[PDB]
Symmetry: D3
Subunit: 285 residues, 6 copies
Amino acid sequence: TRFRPDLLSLDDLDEAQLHALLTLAHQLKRGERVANLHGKVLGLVFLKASTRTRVSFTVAMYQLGGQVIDLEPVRDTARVLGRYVDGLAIRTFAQTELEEYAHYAGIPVINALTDHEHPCQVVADLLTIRENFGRLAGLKLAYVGDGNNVAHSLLLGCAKVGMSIAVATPEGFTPDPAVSARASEIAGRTGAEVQILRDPFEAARGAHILYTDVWTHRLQLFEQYQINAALLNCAAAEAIVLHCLPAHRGEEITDEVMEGPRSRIWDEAENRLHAQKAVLAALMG
Amino acid sequence: TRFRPDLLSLDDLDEAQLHALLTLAHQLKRGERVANLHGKVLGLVFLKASTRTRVSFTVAMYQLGGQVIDLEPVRDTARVLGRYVDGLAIRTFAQTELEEYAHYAGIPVINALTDHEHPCQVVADLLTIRENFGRLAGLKLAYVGDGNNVAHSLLLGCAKVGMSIAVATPEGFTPDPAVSARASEIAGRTGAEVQILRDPFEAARGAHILYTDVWTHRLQLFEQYQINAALLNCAAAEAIVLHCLPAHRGEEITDEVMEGPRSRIWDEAENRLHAQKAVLAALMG
Amino acid sequence: TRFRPDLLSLDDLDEAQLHALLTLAHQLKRGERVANLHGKVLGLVFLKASTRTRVSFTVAMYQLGGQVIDLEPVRDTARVLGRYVDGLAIRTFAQTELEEYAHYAGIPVINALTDHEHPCQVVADLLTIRENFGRLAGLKLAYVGDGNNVAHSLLLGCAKVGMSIAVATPEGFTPDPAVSARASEIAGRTGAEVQILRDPFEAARGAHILYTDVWTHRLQLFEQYQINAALLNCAAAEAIVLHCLPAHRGEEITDEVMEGPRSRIWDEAENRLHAQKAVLAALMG
Amino acid sequence: TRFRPDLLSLDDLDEAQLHALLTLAHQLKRGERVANLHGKVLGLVFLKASTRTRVSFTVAMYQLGGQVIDLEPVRDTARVLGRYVDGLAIRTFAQTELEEYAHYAGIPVINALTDHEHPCQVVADLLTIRENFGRLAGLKLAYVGDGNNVAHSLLLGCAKVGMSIAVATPEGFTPDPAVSARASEIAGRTGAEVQILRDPFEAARGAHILYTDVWTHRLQLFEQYQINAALLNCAAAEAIVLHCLPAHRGEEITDEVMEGPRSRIWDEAENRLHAQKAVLAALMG
Amino acid sequence: TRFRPDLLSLDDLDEAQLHALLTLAHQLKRGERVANLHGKVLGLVFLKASTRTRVSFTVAMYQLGGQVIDLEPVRDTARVLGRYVDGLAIRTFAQTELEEYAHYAGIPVINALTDHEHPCQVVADLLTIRENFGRLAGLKLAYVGDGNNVAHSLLLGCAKVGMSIAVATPEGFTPDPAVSARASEIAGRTGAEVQILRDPFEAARGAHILYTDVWTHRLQLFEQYQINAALLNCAAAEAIVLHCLPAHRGEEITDEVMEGPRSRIWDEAENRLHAQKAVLAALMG
Amino acid sequence: TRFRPDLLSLDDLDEAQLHALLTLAHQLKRGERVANLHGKVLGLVFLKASTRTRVSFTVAMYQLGGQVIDLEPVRDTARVLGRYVDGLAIRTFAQTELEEYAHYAGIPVINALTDHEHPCQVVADLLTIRENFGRLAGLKLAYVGDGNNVAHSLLLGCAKVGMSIAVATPEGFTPDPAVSARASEIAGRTGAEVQILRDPFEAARGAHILYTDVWTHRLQLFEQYQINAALLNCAAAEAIVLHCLPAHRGEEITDEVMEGPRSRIWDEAENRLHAQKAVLAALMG
């Protein structure tokens, strides 16, 4: 399978590319296949610190046998960096800045995280879901909280693998309507339902996965959007709980649920490494 | 007219005390009367800078002939301060910490600003409105934006003067239910009607005064509450526009209206000086 | 009686001068006498911020009818300052730097606080003791804790007024040997006794005043010097408790004693005002 | 003699106004005349700290019987400030910003110091020179160093009083051509000669006043522009040395000269107060 | 032999384990043996930056063929870290925090330094002592200074290999009585003696090693504990001088001794690398 | 050819050593040669951050198969570092401090950049010029801007390969006369000519390479020293434009030229890597 040069948005992967990437991630993780980026160097440019993201990308590159380095107009820094390293994993606020790097770098650019999307988190999430249910299509994912970057990637990711998704948020914090429309377009072709709503318990109905993230009056506004025992009980019988981290116990989730038997948060976190190894191999391999 | 020792909340004043304070303010402003705090010192304790609040309080004391000074458990600092100065104008975050100083100070304490209320700002606003319509009772005030500290004082103040008030705030940014309840409790005995709405135009229609403050997805949630030409045209023909300041042109208000012939912002700002002179004379006199 | 132009060390005043100063402070406080510094300005140059010291000096000058201003080689800044204001209350770390200012300023310099001494605090303490015993000579004062700047000024001050003093501190926290020797030399002619000890209960035995200050392993080294009920019971029946402030309840003193009937801490703090009015009038008069 | 509302640049004063101001400064200094701004408040807004400047302005207002206070689009800040205080002394970097304030304040604005000029310093200098030589016109002033803000105000000041002036600076550090051109234009009417040169000895030849300020490679560049014994030897017999302070001994001036008998730096420094009193009285009187 | 999973305290190693560790360190150093941690990654979590500690740990892992990465409730970050890396070397303040990591990480944890202990430093010191004397048991080590983290590890380390130890510190800065008691308990079985004294000269007598570290009145309190030619002269004829670094010449040691022929400070420093390679190999191997 | 232990100044390489280095870099770049520093660690001590320098040095060492680590009196830190790593690439401000390290480290020290020189940059530039004209001798290099560290290294470097160099700078920003003298002395034996001029259009006439860097009143001094279309037109027809970066478009260079067809800036930047690999190989080989 051929991949586009960069991974700036999950929408850079069509259904075929995403499934190929997910299969590779599984194979690499299980030792069924091996990849190597020996002699290659991954550059990390985070306009904002993120140890979590730095360590997962770095160990991922080390296990591929490569090296890593943590790192004026962007076109200048991008062009020179394109002369030293072989890949760039970058975190910036503006999706547009990320795109400028990809435009001048001359080497593969990977979205480590922007205000708009977080493609790698969701590839790791899809990985975790598949390992828990032995499938992705037909499942239902309920995301409660702020319609943010992870919500955006989830909308695209779920739709691309035929998974239904219900995104429940407070009135003024809905996901970008253009992304939700893009996700519906995709879902129409994979047989999935895409829903953007207000009530979390309605989104949770029948959900196999409950997903949340940190919240952006604060209390009154998001309080109902918390994955707790009540939300869990109202979801599919074998529901699982995901959270991209870090978590604020008492806000979007309870300690009880987080430390509960339905939590797959730690496996989800590990998969960040396995997912990113697949992308690094697919784009730099 | 006996006033309570401190002015922590606008509710420390009954309808009579408020009107008395307002009358005193008017007279002092027009020289129709004279006060003198010579020999006394006003201590300012702002846990959060506020040049605007500091300058209006300081000049207010100077015109009364007093002096000013800008300034471990609060009980300790408050007791020692009560031995050096004769009054405290303080700005804290918690309304309780303010009550803390008031409890141990042994000298009058005035709320210069807290997360919960802004009494002095409203007395100023009531003064400005009075000067613009020759009355307060029967008028309708419409507040749009975040249900914050000034909205709280506005509710209590308007009610106490027989001024009807309609506060329109976004979904999860409603005024504290307890203050609005209390305002309605006062409204019934004064003849004004307290409305807490969601729709800004509903509140502005018929309004004699359009009032707004700075806002707490951000845009998505506040755009409709901006006071502009469209909203102005809805209120009374001779409606006035107030804004406690500082203002963000383009958000809660437009440059057009702010610099427009309906704006009373600058006179409103000046009345902070006269309003506070009245509060200082009343409690330290 | 005539005073040296400055007050850098309590040793700047001999027996006659310190008594003259205390008498002036008493009369000023009772109004038995009056002073005036109208047209004069006091410059406050505090290298280290201190609201407690700032407020007492500023109100002190205000009650004398003067003004106040809160504030490169020191000889340059001192000579220029000496051309604008009429006196400086300065707080530095090094006694030497303080003397630097006094040498070039050309106007009276007062030690608002240095690592080495705190003469104004003690003048206020002596006033407080006098207001509780009707005399100074013959009394016994016990200082427990760290032999710091206040302890130094107490050694000198007590010695000069015929008050016996016992300072109890941990092994390596004794007061400057040179100040102790100088105090003993003064006491030798005033009939006072000077004791630099290790045992707090020994020092407190029959003391008329129990004095402590904030402390400089730390716990397991000062814990025994805490003025609590037990230590108070070792003191004379009419014993008084002083603390220059701020206080750390649970450490050098307990809330019980601090808030108890033997405490004169708040009168002591107020006396900083009356004490400083005395020095300002005496040096700037 | 009527004065323009503000003093943003020394050019805001024509020959008549500058002379009336110096005369008033002298009269007030000698007590030959008295002025009062009782009831008025001077606002100080220094975007850049400047103790020397803050103290000289504050004592100036105090001696005039007024009060002073130390203190978002500037047009808002200025308009509200204009409702509380009676005058503003501001120190900023950009001259335009200063003009923004003057445009919106509605009250007198005085340039406490900007990157472009330092008028109050030069009125103090002119006052000092007048007291030393008994006149101003016909005298010659040599300024050596960086063509900065004080250099600009000196070019204007000297020209206006008919004092000839020679400013020697390193090639790329000449003063603003526009101010020089403006100074030459003024000098034509007053019979003074303006010279912008390179060689400091040429500039100092027959000068009655040697003036310097702090400099901006750097050493070799400004090294020769130092007022030392040698430079002083090329100037007039009764030559005096001025320096606006602070000074960097060893660079623009030597300790020997600075502390020598030809120095009038401290008198010059004190005249800031007397000059500023005249500016306050003249614009706020 | 077998080792406990973590090295949080030197007491985590019984006599056989410490010796096995010292032996391994020596063999790795002389190349008499080899080891590698290829494909493994060491995570560094230093809550208090330490470049010297970071470089020694990082180069140790590199020479073992592994990689290194420098890196919310601790239990959350520990569990996530445990899914990415194979070992953690951490620097915290609280020993208990260090224990939190070990409990949740799921991978070996090494104490890179805490307020309570510094085991890796002591293993390095032991290696150094052994190389200089050809043995450990029967020797006498004198530690002078503050009874801190290294003193605690020295107490346990020394007793464990049969080395007698005398720790001299000021009255209030003695080592944790519990570690001393534990060390004396171990010494009873190894034939060594443990002494906690006050006098540095008494401690240093007959000592083969003089050891000090940065100190916590300051001078008056610690001065006597300084290791200088005088103290060195009281030690055994072949006495060596150790210091964990960094050093403050003039305080705990003099430049003279530190640069003298009896100093083994640099070899001790180098051994940080050799001792740490041994712990990494032993716990991650 | 044998090299000295360090590369602190370009003058540490005679003409013969410079060519060998340049040849090694080229061979390494084209794969006509292969070096390896396996088992070695390079430490980077940058007293001033420089991602540009850090990345070029780190990827260089990685391509040689070694490791890299980014890292109190210098003599202590140098001695300890010398026990852990095998080489130091360091960035300081003073050349003297750089020498301190080399003196005590006991391991090869490379000048990553100092206020005085930038050797590695120049070896990269030389290698770039060579790749563009197939020769170095006979060619002419014109530098315009501030006579800084790179100008200094270009002077020594150009002369050493027989390349004529003309350096144009404003009057007070000329190259260190000592390096110009030393450059001329070298040129005397290589047959190249060295010129320190004021006019940039003079220096550029007949140049095959126009070189500039960021500039040190600032504009009206460096303004005329911009490499633009006009300046280019005055040089040889096959003229190349070099800039060590970062660049300030509109100041020392125009976007047009930087982005134009004569620019070799990006190739020049990549060559920092190939040049540094040659130094690392040569000095640590």
